[PDB]
């Protein structure tokens, strides 16, 4: 069973990959944007759609992780080890939690075809000898 | 203000399915079958829909993301055990993991498998069905319970 | 490779697998079963069907491993490790054999159909804490 | 019961007796030949053919022999017999599965006649005297 | 024979040429680019193109060289040789991997077309002295 | 991403590793045999086919490493390495080179199946155990 989190939204893990890890905003960030302009929905009663199950979901898993993560400090003493965890979960985790929140998010936002599109876009012009590409990096509109 | 933390934030992985976290309750926490098998039952009848590039129903999607959190459970557990120097302490974290996270993980993949094998409706009907049974005091709860399956 | 005996069939080993060990009868007794009504188109030169083609195919490892164990009856000779083979035969390999004779002569006598959907509730069952589980287990029917 | 492993596919153990036993390639080749034409399918989840069930199965009984042979090796502790088994197992059976497994991908590989023909067509050269018995026996192919 | 890798392509080595060496990027995201995306078809049983094959035949030729590093790297000796070896492939042959994978991609994303008119355009420029070129260089776009 | 030289073409690495290493005849011959009956194609301003196109890639690639072959045996100055690279240059990365221009140049000239159908006709004979193997081992031709 090798489940892959974007192939039902036309993308893949490979792809998100294609941007820079440092690139994704905070989880923090995210969360705050999915409450900011969709809260509404996600705790609507409809599935609104996968992207919002998904996303749904998504933000519910990286809770749990929050949660494992207090416990933790909250049960363990060895700190040098309590915190090896209680980072692990904030930092290799949450990367991923990063970028599976910005997918949704931002398709819901710009429109998967867009977001896709972002995605190869970018992450081509990023890997572009500046002396020749577009000046400015590109940007997700409506 | 200042503002900020959890009570205050309604999202249910149940409600969009006309369930909620609060109604499983009926449910004795103690009576979901193993991650395992929950899991092994997934792939039964589900690995090549659930592989495919097609979201296939609220229940897959939802479904695949709770087969990986579980996952990255599974993997958080793993490197655990392989960077905390503290043993008792890596057997803490190990089992909080391994446990308890893991009921939850439980309870999805039940209700989504479920549904999917027996039908949203059906699958909560059990629940209320189970409900009363259960919640019938000993004196009177019968013989067999409530189940879902094939007559 | 990988190959899951069961796929062809629309089932899986995952499936098949909550069968718990008492459950399917004994290997003479599937056997027995099978000579007992499908002998003659298990004999016959017809494939008839990818079930039954299967099922000799398994009927006849099943012979090869009795062999292997009467061989080893007269050819083992520290009794102590010449029993220690001739049980796994009998016993883990045999329960192996087990499955794949009831999975297929059952299918035989009440369809992959029927016989899956079994296999579906039978799960569900037995996947029940006993707190839970009705006293009694479901049999398998032709409705 | 007498069930003939090849009747069903237009032959008969009778009839494969043509072949010398010392004729068969080795497991390995053969399951190497296997998966080199047939992984795919063979994993496929609908049975492609009768040949294909058959051997499907044949592949997967000498794989229980594997492991018949290999928890023999992990607990008989007197080697003598333990290595008694490990061959017998390693050695014997292994002769029909070699059969097996060689008369379903040939088939597979060239066509139940033409394999069937093959068969008639060897007996003759193995059977002609040594007088008059061709260089090069006959040999499947395409 | 005397093969110009391009010609197939509408394109001739000459052509090619103005593209200085900084301008294309890093073997490795060009290989990365490539993955990102074309990688399944690049992967899949579909010639999909003579731009496609080509593609393949070089993300290949290029790992050749990978090993003929990595071996020469654990097994030539005198490092200082050792290491003039592994540079020479680093460097020079991967520079030109690079084109390759650059003139190939590239089409594959905008099309001999646009690539081929980008490469007439840049050549202009590039071959501009400095007193007179204008300050930004040509950048390929899809139009 | 894994690329197989061979999947497109219908064949693969697996199937051509029927064929035994020490038979692709010599870059050479290859190369020789490939300016023989196709220089005028591969020079051609057209893809005359897949086959050629990778045939042209192939003859390219080769070259490479003759250059590289070359530059070390004129840039290293202790011999016993600079032979070292010289060698593994000129004989390990030759096979693949000589699997690559053999595979193409021959199907250019019998035919993808007839030239699949010989890779398959050869395992057998190859396979075939000593006893009962042909004098000759089967051959391509037109």
């Known amino acids: 069973f090798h489940i892959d989190p974007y192939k039902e939204f036309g993308a893949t ?10 690139f994704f905003p905070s989880v923090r960030d995210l969360l705050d944007t999915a409450a900011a302009l969709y809260r509404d929905a996600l705790e609507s009663p409809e599935h609104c759609s996968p992207h919002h199950t998904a996303l749904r979901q998504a933000i519910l898993c990286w809770g749990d992780l929050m949660t494992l993560a207090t416990w933790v400090g909250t049960n363990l003493e060895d700190p040098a080890s309590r915190d090896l965890v209680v980072s692990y ?46 000046p400015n990096a590109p940007i997700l509109s409506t």
Do not use: M
């Open 89 to 134: 979960v904030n930092t290799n985790v949450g990367l991923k939690f990063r970028q599976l929140l910005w997918f949704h998010i931002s398709c819901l936002t710009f429109g998967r075809e867009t977001v896709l599109e972002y995605l190869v876009s970018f992450g081509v012009w990023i890997r572009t000898p500046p002396a020749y590409r577009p």
């Open 13 to 22: 893990v490979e792809l998100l990959s294609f941007l820079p890890s440092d």
